[PDB]
Write a protein that binds this ligand. Sequence first.
Ligand SMILES: *[C@H](S)Nc1ccc(CCc2ccc(N[C@@H](*)S)cc2S(=O)(=O)O)c(S(=O)(=O)O)c1
Ligand SMILES: *[C@H](S)Nc1ccc(CCc2ccc(N[C@H](*)S)cc2S(=O)(=O)O)c(S(=O)(=O)O)c1
Lengths: 223, 223, 475, 475, 218, 218
Amino acid sequence: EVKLQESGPGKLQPSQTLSLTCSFSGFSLTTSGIGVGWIRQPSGKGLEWLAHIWWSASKYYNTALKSRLTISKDTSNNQVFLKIASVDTADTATYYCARAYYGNYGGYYFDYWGQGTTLTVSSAKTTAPSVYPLAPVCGDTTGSSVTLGCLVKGYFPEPVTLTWNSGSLSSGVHTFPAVLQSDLYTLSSSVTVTSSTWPSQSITCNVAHPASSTKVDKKIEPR
Amino acid sequence: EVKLQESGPGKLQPSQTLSLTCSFSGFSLTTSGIGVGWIRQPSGKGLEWLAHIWWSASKYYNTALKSRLTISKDTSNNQVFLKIASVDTADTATYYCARAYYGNYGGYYFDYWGQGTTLTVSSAKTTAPSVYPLAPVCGDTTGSSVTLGCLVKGYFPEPVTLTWNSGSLSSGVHTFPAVLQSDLYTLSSSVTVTSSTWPSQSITCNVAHPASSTKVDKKIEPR
Amino acid sequence: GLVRDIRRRYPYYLSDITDAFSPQVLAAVIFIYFAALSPAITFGGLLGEKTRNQMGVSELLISTAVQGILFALLGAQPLLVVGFSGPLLVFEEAFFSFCETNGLEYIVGRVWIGFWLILLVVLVVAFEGSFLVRFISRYTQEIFSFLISLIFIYETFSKLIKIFQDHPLQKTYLPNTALLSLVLMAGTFFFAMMLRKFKNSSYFPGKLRRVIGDFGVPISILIMVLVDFFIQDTYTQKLSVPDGFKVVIHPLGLRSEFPIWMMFASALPALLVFILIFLESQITTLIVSKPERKMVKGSGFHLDLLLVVGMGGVAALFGMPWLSATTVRSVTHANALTVMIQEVKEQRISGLLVAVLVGLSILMEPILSRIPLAVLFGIFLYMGVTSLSGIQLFDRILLLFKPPKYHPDVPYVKRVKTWRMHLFTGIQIICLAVLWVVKSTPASLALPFVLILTVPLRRVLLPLIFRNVELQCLD
Amino acid sequence: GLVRDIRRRYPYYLSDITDAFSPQVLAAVIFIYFAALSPAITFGGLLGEKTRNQMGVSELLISTAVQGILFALLGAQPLLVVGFSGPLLVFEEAFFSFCETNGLEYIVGRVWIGFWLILLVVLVVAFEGSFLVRFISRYTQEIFSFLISLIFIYETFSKLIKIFQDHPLQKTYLPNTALLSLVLMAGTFFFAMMLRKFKNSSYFPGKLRRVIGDFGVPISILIMVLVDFFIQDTYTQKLSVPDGFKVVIHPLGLRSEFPIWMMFASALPALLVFILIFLESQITTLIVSKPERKMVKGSGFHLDLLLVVGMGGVAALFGMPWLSATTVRSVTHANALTVMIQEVKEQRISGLLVAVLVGLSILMEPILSRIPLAVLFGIFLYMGVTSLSGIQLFDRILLLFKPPKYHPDVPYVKRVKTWRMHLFTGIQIICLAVLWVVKSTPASLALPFVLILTVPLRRVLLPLIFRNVELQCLD
Amino acid sequence: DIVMTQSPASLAVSLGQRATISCRASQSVSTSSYSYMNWYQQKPGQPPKLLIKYASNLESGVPARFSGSGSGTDFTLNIHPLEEEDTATYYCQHSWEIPWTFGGGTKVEIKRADAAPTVSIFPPSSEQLTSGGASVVCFLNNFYPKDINVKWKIDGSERQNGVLNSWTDQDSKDSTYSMSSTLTLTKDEYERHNSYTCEATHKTSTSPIVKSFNRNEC
Amino acid sequence: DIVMTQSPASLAVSLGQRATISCRASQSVSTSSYSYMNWYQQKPGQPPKLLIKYASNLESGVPARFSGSGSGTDFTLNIHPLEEEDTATYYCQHSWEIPWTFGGGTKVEIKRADAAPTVSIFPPSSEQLTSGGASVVCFLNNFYPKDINVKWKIDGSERQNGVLNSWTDQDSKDSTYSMSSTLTLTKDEYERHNSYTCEATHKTSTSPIVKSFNRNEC
Ligand SMILES: *[C@H](S)Nc1ccc(CCc2ccc(N[C@@H](*)S)cc2S(=O)(=O)O)c(S(=O)(=O)O)c1
Ligand SMILES: *[C@H](S)Nc1ccc(CCc2ccc(N[C@H](*)S)cc2S(=O)(=O)O)c(S(=O)(=O)O)c1
C-alpha cells in the first residue's frame, strides 16, 4: 500500500527557513530506481518541481531555487526532508511529496502523490475561525426541499476543513472556496435535504482549522 | 480517281458459265501490294468473298467455290475477270469488284468498291405480270381513311415498276419488295387515302414491265 | 564422295551409346537443354509475330526436336546442335513480307525454296562441296565466332536492359522487378563461374568436387530458381511454353494457285538460304573439331551438309522451319562434355536427349514455368564468355591491352611482331567492325558474302604485308 | 621505462613527414577516411539514442578527431587509428542505465571514471605494464582478430538485411530500394576486388596500373556513388552528418551534488574500461607490427597506452567519449600503405589527415550526403575479407576444407599433424565459439577476461596435448 | 478458315444515343501489337464503304462519332451520337489470313414508340377469279417493332400453306414497318370454304388484330 | 532546460464529445523508438494522478477513453467519450532530462443545459450579531453557465462594497456551478436599514431571481 504523507508548519514568517517532512510506506528508499521528492503548486497555478533524492544520496535540485534548497533523507525511518532558506511570499503554495519511478525504458514519472500540505508565507497573525450556523429565513413557506448553510469567517491562514455530520451527510453538498479580504478568509457551505429530513433529523456543521488548532461543531437549529 | 466498274450478263440459264468483267482506273495492277477481285452479295444477305488476283498472277480463291472459280487479268487493258462454271440458282446475286490494299502493318482490306453488277440465274421463261386491282371488302364498315391495294403476280424476271395515278399520288404509298415463288415473282402495293377522297376521286394502279414491254393501268373500283 | 565420313564414323557410332553413361553427360544434357530451348521459344515467338502465325513456335519446336533427333543419330558430328538462328529469322521475315506484298502463298513459296535446297545440296554434296571448306582458315573462324560471341553477349544484355525499360525505377503505381531481374541474372552467372573455378580449384575431394563442378550450370539455375520461388510478391518474366502443339503442303498452293514462274524463281532465295546454312554449319564444324581440342576422332563435313539442309528442305515441305548448326550452342555443347587440356566425351545420347527434351517441353510446361528468364540470361552471359575461350583472336585483343613484358607459348609471334602483331590483330578488329556494321542493317543478309569477301580476299592481300614464316605462325 | 619507445620513434618522426608524399598515401587517406567516419557517425548516433543525447554524435566526432590528431603526432605507432568501438558502446549504455537508475549525473560519474583511468594508466605505464603483453601469443591474436573480422563481416550483412526489412519486396504503395541497396553494395565490393587484382595482375603498364590499383577503393566508391547519383527516382540511405557541432564538467556535479561514495566507487567501472582499451589496443599493436609484415621499425607499446587512455580520461572530463585503438580499422590502414611482400609506408600524415578530415566532415556534409550507405557497406565487406589475410588460423580453417594433398611452406606442421593440426585449429574454433557466445550476451563485457581465460590458460593446458617441437611450429 | 459472329442481328437505337455492335472471331486475329479486324458500312442499295481498319483506326473521312475497339477474338463498333444517316448494315471482316471472311452483319435501325399495325383484308379481285386463281391479301401497315406474327384462318382453322409475306424497309419518315401476306388458293378451293381471316399478332397488343370476310357474302 | 507549452489554456466540450489537448516541447523529447512524455490528471482539491507514460502508454487502471499520442516536440491527449467526472486540470511533463518540468495545465470543463440558479438568502446569525458583526449571505446554487451577476439591494438602492463572492468548481456529477455572496456590515449599520435583497441575474432568464428579508422582521 504505497503511501506518502506531507507535514509542514502551516504558516511561516518571511525570511525564515521552511522545513518540510515526508513520511512514506509501502516501499523502501533502499530500492534501486526509486526516488522521493517535492513538487509545489502555488494557489491557482500549475506544478513546479523542487527536488528529489535517491538511495544513492545523489540529489537533484531545481535551478534558480537550488541555492535555497536542501534535501535529505532518513531511510531507516522512511522519511525525506526539504529545507528552503530565506522563505518569501512567493513560496506560499501546496507542497506535494511524490514518488519517482525509474521507467522500464529509462526516465522517470511520478508514481504516487501524497495528499499535499498547504504553506502560507505571511507577516500577518494566525486567527481562528468563527463558525456560524445558517438556518432558513423565519416564516419562509417551505418547499419540497430545504437548504442549510454554514458560514466560516475571520480565519487565517488557509486551510480550513468542513464536513456535514462528519462525512455521513455527503450528497447535495456545495462547499465554497475561500476568499481573502483584508488578511482574513471567508468560507461557506450549502447543503440541501428534503423538507421531511429537517428539522426532523439533526444536521451539524463541523469545521476544523489546523493553524489555530480548533475543532468546532455547530448544530443547525431553526431561528 | 479510283474507279471500278463491273459488267455481267444480267441473267443466266442454270448449268451455264458466268463470265464477269471488271474494268478500273486511277491505279495500275502492275503496282506491288495491290490486288483486284470479286465479292458477292445475294439478295438481302451478307458478303461472300469469291477470288482475287495480284500482279504476281498469284490468285486466291474461295474454298468450296475454288473448283468453279477461275480468275484472270488483262493488265494492259486495266481489267480482271472471274468465271464461274455450271452456274446454279444459288449464284443469283450482286457481284462487287473490290480492290484490296496491302496494309501498312500487313494484311489487306478492301479499298474501293465497284457499284456492283447484278446477276439472276433461272430456268424461267420471260412472263408478263397479271395486274389485279384490290378494293376493300364489300360492305366494310368504313372509317376515317381507306386502304386500296394493287397485286402484281406471275412475272419474270425482275424489275417491275408501279405508280399510283402516275406519280401524282405519292404520299402514303407502301410498295413491297418482290418475292419469288416457283420461278415467278409476286409484288404488291398499298395506298391509303381519306374516306372522303375515295371512291369520290379515282385512283389508278400503273404497272410497267420491260422484259415483256407491257404497261398497265388498272382503275380501283368498288365491289 | 561423302562416304569417307560415314565410314569414318559408323564404327564409332555403336561405341557412342556406351560412351555416354557418365555424369558429365547428364549435366551437359540439362545445360544444353536450356541452351537450346530458350532460343527455340524466343525465336519461335518472334517468328510467329512476324509471319502472323503462319510459321509459329510449335512448328519450330517440332522441327528442332525431330531434326535434332535425326542428326543426333545419323550425324558425322553428333556434337553439333541444330537450331533456329537470327539470320534465318531475318530471312523468314523478309520472304514473308515479300510473298504477301506480291500476294504469294507464303508457306507454299517456302516449300519451293525447300525443293531448291534439297536440289542444291544433292549437287554440292555429290560434287565435293566441302572442298571449298578446306580453304577456310583460322583468320576466318576467329573473326566469325568472336563476332558471334560478342553479338551474343550484347544481345543478352540488351534483353536485360529491355526488362529495365518495361519496368523503370520510379515511385508508384511494374515496380521492384527490374532490379531483381538483374540480381537474378548476375547471381546465376556468378555461381556458374564460381562452381567452374571450384571444379578446377583445390578445395574438396575427387568425385565430389568434379561432379559438383560438372553440374555447375544446372546447380546455379536450380539455386536461383529457388530464390525466385521463395520471393513470392514480385513479378519475374518466366519461360513460356505453348499449352499444346497447334499451328503436307501442296506445292501448287492451298488458297492459291501458286504462280509457276515463282516456283522457278524460288531458286534464288533458296540459294541465299543454302549459303547461310552452309557457311554457318561448316564454320561451326571447323571450330568444334579443331586440332586444339583433343577430339580428333569420329567427325566429318559431308554427311552434315546433306543431313542439315536435307532436313531443311523436307521440313519446308511440311511447313516447318529449316535449321542450321548453331555456333555458340554447339561450342558450349562441346565444352560440356570437355575435360581439363583433356579428351572430350563424344555422344549421340547427349544431343539425342536435349532434342527429345525440347520436344517434350510442352509437357514440361509446369516445370519450365517456374524458371525465371533472368536466370537463363545469366547462363547465357556465361555461355558467351565461355565461348570466348579458344579464340586466338580474342587472346590477342587481350594481349594488346597487356604490357609487352608478357609473352606467348611461341616467342616467334610476339618477338617478330612487338608492334606488328597488334596490326594483324588490328585488321582482325577492322574486319570485325565491317561485318558488325553490315550485319547491323536489314542489309545484314548480305553478310555471309561479306565474311568471305573480307577474309579469303584479305587472306591474299595479307601476304602483301608479311611473309610465309611471319603470317604462317599466326594460324 | 616508456622512454625506450620515445627514443625509438622520435628520430624516425622527423623522417615520417617526408615519407608521406606518395600517392598510395593519398588513396589510403581517402579509404581510411571513410572507414573511420562511417563508424563515427553510426556509433555516435547509437551513443546518442542510448544516453538520450547526453553523450552524442558530435562529441564522438570531436573526440575522434582531436585524439586522432594528437596520437597521430605523438604516437609510438602512427599506423594505429583511434576510434569508438562496440564494447565501449555496451559500457556507455550500461553505465548510463545504472547511473540514471540510481539517479547519478551520468556525465559526471563518467568524469570520475576518467580520473581513475588517468591514475590507472600512470601506474601501469610507469611500472612496466606492457610486460604482460609479451605473453600474448599468436594463438591469442589470431582467435581475436578472426573473431573480430567475422563479427565485422556479419554486422555489415546485418545492416544490409536490415535495409531489406525496412523495405521488403512487395506490391504498392519504401519500394524498389532494398534491391538497389543490395546492388550498390555488391557492385562496390566487386569493383574493389577487381581493381585490387588489376593492381597485382599483368594488364596495363607501370605507374598507371599501380596507382589505379592503389586507388581501387576510392575509384570503386566514386563509380557506385555516380551510379546512385544518376539513379534519381529511388530512395537510398546516405551518410548523415549533423549540420553543425552541438551537444569542462564540474566533477562535483551540474544538476547534483554528485555523491562522494560513487566518486570513489567509479574506480571499478574505470577498471573494466581500462581492461577493455588495454586488451584491444595492445593486441592490435601486436598484430599491426608483427614480424611477417616488413614494418619492423618505428613502433612501441608503452607510449600508446599512456597516450590513448590518457586522452580518454581527459576527454571524459570534457564530456567526450574515450577511445581505444581499433583492430579492423588499424589493420586496413596498415595494408593501405602496404606494398607487395614489400615494405609498408609509415606516416604520421595519413592518420593526421583522416583525423582532421573526420573533424571537418561537418563542413563536408553536402559531399557526404551524396554517398549512399550501401556503397560503404560494400567497402566494409571488402575490409572484412581483407582483414582476414595475415591470420594463420584462417589459413588453417581453410586448410581443413582442403584436400590433404596440398601442403604449407613448412612440411613439418601438416606432416606431423595430418589429423592433429585439424584438432589444434579445432580448439581454435571452439574458443571462437565460446567467445562468440560470451560476446553474444549483454554479459559480453566479461569477454576481455574470457579471452585471456581461454588462451593463456589453454596455452598451458595445450602442452598437455603436443610437444615443444610440435606446438612450437604452430606459432 | 476463320468464322465471325456478329451480334445483335438487329439493333434499334434512339437518335443521339449509342449503338454498340460486336464481332467475335473463331480464333484470335491479333498480334502482340496489332489487331486485324476491319469494319464496313453498307447503306441500302450501295456497295460497302470502309470505316475502320486495324480494329480502331478510322479510315480517312469517316466521322468521329464512329469509333472501333477490341482485341484477340473480341471486337466492338460504336456509333455515338447516332444520327439519322447512320441507319445502315454494318459488317466486320478479318485480315488475318486468306480467305478473308465477313461477319453476318448488324442492321442499325432507329427506335420509336411501339405502334400497332393497321390491318386490311382483301378478297380476290373478280378479274383474278375469272382466270381460275384466288389471292386473299392482308396488309399490316405502319407498325413497330418490325417483328410480327401473321396467321391465316379458314373457317376457324389455321392455314399456313400458300402464304407468302414481304416486309417494307424501315420508313425513312416515320420509322415504321409494313408487311404483306398473300394467301393463294385455286378458285375451286376458295369456293369450297366460307370465312377468311388474317390475324396479326404483335407486341403492341395481347389481342391479335384480325380482319375477316365471307366468300360471295357481304 | 526544457520548456513546455500546453494548449488550449481552457477547453469546454459537450458530454460524450472529444476533448483534445496539445503539449509542445522546446526541444525534441523522443528517441528513435520512445517518447518521454507523461500525462497527469488533477481533479480540484486532489493531488495529480498519472494517466499516461511514454506518450501513449495508459497507466494501469486509467480509463480507455483516455489516450495519448505524438512524438518529437508535439504531443496530444484525447478524452473520448468525455464524461462528467473528467472535468479536471490536465498536465504534461517530460522525462528527457533533469530538471523535470511541467506544462502549465489545461482545464477541461463540461458544457451543459443553461440551468437556473437556486437562490437563498440568510440574515446574520444572532451569534455573530452578539459580537458586533453582520453578514448577509446569498447562495446561488446549481446554475450554468458559470458567469452570473449578483446585485445586493439595501432599501431599493444597490450596494457593492463589503461584498465578496466565491465560485464552486464545475460539479463532476451534474456539471453545474454554484456561488456564494457575502455582504458584511457592522451591527450598527445593519440595524440602520430595513430591507435586504440579493438579486441573481443570469443568462437563463431575463428576470433576476431575487430574495429578500426585512431586518428584525418575519
Ligand atoms: C534469346 S535466346 N534471344 C535472342 C535474340 C537475338 C539473338 C541473335 C541476334 C542475331 C544473332 C546473330 C546474327 N547474325 C550472325 S550469325 C544476327 C542477329 S540479329 O540482330 O537479329 O540480326 C539471339 S542468338 O544469339 O542467335 O542466340 C537470341
Ligand atoms: C556500422 S559501421 N556500425 C557498426 C555496428 C556494429 C558493429 C559491431 C558490433 C560489435 C563489435 C564489437 C563487439 N565486441 C568485440 S570486439 C561487439 C559488438 S555487438 O554485436 O554490438 O555486441 C560495428 S564494428 O564491427 O565494430 O565496426 C559497426
